[PDB]
């Protein structure tokens, strides 16, 4: 039995994380709650919630309303350098692209996320990207180290090291130096608007992807457009101290936010994927297959996913189904 | 009859300016050709040459030179040192569904109005201490009123009813935002336009699921890139869409993905579509509109017959076969 800090979040967050704390229980994973809550108070998270995952190692996390954001905080406070986006087409859930098995592997710290900027001058405007050996070694040892671990053969590193020569490069040079480290894994590198239009072109031809923090900001929601949306993503944050959270990165939903309707897909296939990094994969992998069957059976499909039924009907369909394991 | 300067560049480039003269002759155009060429040495000679000729010509068409991104920061793009120099500020291009080229998607009709000299592309770089490198993104009002003022203007003359610009001034507040700022300013001037923004994230998303949305788009440098890409894609590659770079007085026509395509060099399988509609529309600019009508119909024309599509769309024919096909539609005007 082990503990997870879970933070509802707001709006459809509270009744998502009771879905999935429920469709858990159901599965019985070896998994209690620790309901914490996170407001900046003055800026840091609240003393009692910052100690619980210190001890937990292990989080899950709902949407959050945003103004001070409160993943740049839970970004800062727990060291969370690697984003990582496995994006995978949904067979229930048809979309143009039926082939998507893809991970982004984000730098999280730095780049073009540095926080400064200067007015040079009126109408002259500066933005600094910044970019370190340090956090470019650590992200690209995390990408094969991902790839390893998780049944992987191809990594490309994606640049612009022609328009951005020496922060970019540097980037790609640290790439290139733990691709002769791990030689069991295939490298390659791509520049960024190739790998944009090959993505919508052909996104098979491409596997594991470690980048920059813009690029694979914009690239993880490339991604997740390619197999049916924000609604359906799954993310973790991988940090410092071997912790980790895990994220619904849709909106908060303040419209149907306590009026059933809301969708648990995204959490709870983050929730699987805490789980297989936990190395619980036969729980994993029941909660998993029991929300794809009824995402396929399509009868209990949420208002989002062009469905009519609510929350609760979903919820209890993939409950019914794991049970038979 | 026009004296135009080409530059061949490298990859498919020089192969494919062949095919173009070959056309232009076949075609009857009055246009002469007056090659420069630009190669790999760090030192700039080449490209200060090419700037030079373009000043006197005014109107380029360029394939696209390789930049060796193992070289040294000083040894700088040079496709990026030419159209800074020459300060062609509005990169466009056009991705429009063509109807023999069945992809994942249809009805995609957007122009895309790309700031193309500053923002990402400043070539401003350094490192403060061993290890820790700055790269410094610049926006200004100046830069960003005329790329948000040449968006209205076109979106205007073209019967068009919407400008979306897309930025992260999210996160990017001061320099993104500025950006914004501008293209509102713009806004002010044209009632008659829808102005909406977008954040880059959300654009791609979109783009990828209901790219139909999308009318005019105007941004910054780099998210012109990657917008480019993800359109041009949509709509089959890189082989079929062209485009241009104006500045105020000169004009250079290239494709619009910008591709050396070196790994396809010299195989007689280049897709010839995008670098002859960039030469159209060079036709168009130096009002030699018939001409450009005229060749324009008959690439269009060969692309419906799905056996001279190349391998970038599914087809198998090679480009001296698609040029035959071209040449033919003109020969029968
Ligand atoms: N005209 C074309 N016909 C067929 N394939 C093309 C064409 N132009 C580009 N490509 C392909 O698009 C991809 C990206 O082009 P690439 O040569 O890598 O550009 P660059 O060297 O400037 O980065 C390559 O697979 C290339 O072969
Ligand atoms: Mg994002
Ligand atoms: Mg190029």
Known sequence: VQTVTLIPGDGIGPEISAAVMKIFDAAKAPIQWEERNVTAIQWMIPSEAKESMDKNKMGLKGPLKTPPSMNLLLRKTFDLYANVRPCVSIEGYKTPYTDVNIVTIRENTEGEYSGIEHVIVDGVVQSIKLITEGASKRIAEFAFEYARNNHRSNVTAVHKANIMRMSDGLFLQKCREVAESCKDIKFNEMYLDTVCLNMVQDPSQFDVLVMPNLYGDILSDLCAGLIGGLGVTPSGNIGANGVAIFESVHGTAPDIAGKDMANPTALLLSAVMMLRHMGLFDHAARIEAACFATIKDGKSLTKDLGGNAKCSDFTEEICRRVKDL | ?333
Not at chain 2, 115 to 125: A, I, M, R
Not at chain 2, 313 to 329: K, L, W, Y
């Open chain 2, 1 to 333: 009859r026009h004296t135009v300067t080409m530059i061949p560049g490298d990859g498919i480039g020089p192969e494919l300016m062949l095919h173009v003269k070959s056309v232009f002759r076949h075609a009857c155009v009055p246009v002469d050709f007056e090659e420069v060429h630009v190669s790999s040495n760090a030192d700039e000679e080449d490209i200060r040459n090419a700037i030079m000729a373009i000043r006197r010509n005014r109107v380029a068409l360029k394939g696209n030179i390789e930049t060796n991104h193992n070289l040294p920061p000083s040894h700088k793009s040079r496709n990026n040192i030419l159209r800074t120099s020459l300060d062609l500020y509005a990169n466009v291009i056009h991705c429009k569904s063509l109807p023999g080229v069945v992809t994942r998607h249809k009805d995609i009709d957007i122009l895309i109005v790309r700031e193309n000299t500053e923002g990402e592309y400043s070539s401003l770089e350094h490192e403060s201490v061993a290890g820790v490198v700055e790269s410094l993104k610049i926006i200004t009002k100046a830069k960003s009123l005329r790329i948000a003022e040449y968006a209205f203007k076109l979106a205007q003359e073209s019967g068009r009813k919407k400008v979306t610009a897309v930025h992260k001034a999210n996160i990017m507040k001061l320099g993104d935002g500025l950006f914004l700022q501008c293209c509102r300013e713009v806004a002010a001037r044209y009632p008659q336009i829808t102005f909406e923004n977008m954040i880059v994230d959300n654009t791609t998303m979109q783009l990828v699921s209901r790219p139909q949305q999308f009318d005019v788009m105007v941004m910054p440098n780099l998210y012109g890139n990657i917008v480019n890409n993800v359109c041009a894609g949509l709509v089959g590659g890189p082989g079929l869409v062209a485009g241009a770079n104006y500045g105020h007085v000169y004009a250079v026509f290239e494709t619009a993905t910008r591709n050396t395509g070196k790994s396809i060099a010299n195989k007689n399988i280049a897709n010839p579509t995008a670098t002859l509609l960039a030469s159209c529309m060079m036709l168009d600019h130096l009002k030699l509109h018939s001409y450009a009508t005229s060749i324009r119909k008959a690439v269009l024309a060969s692309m419906d017959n799905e056996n001279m599509h190349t391998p970038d769309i599914g087809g198998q024919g090679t480009t001296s076969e698609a040029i035959q096909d071209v040449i033919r539609h003109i020969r029968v005007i």
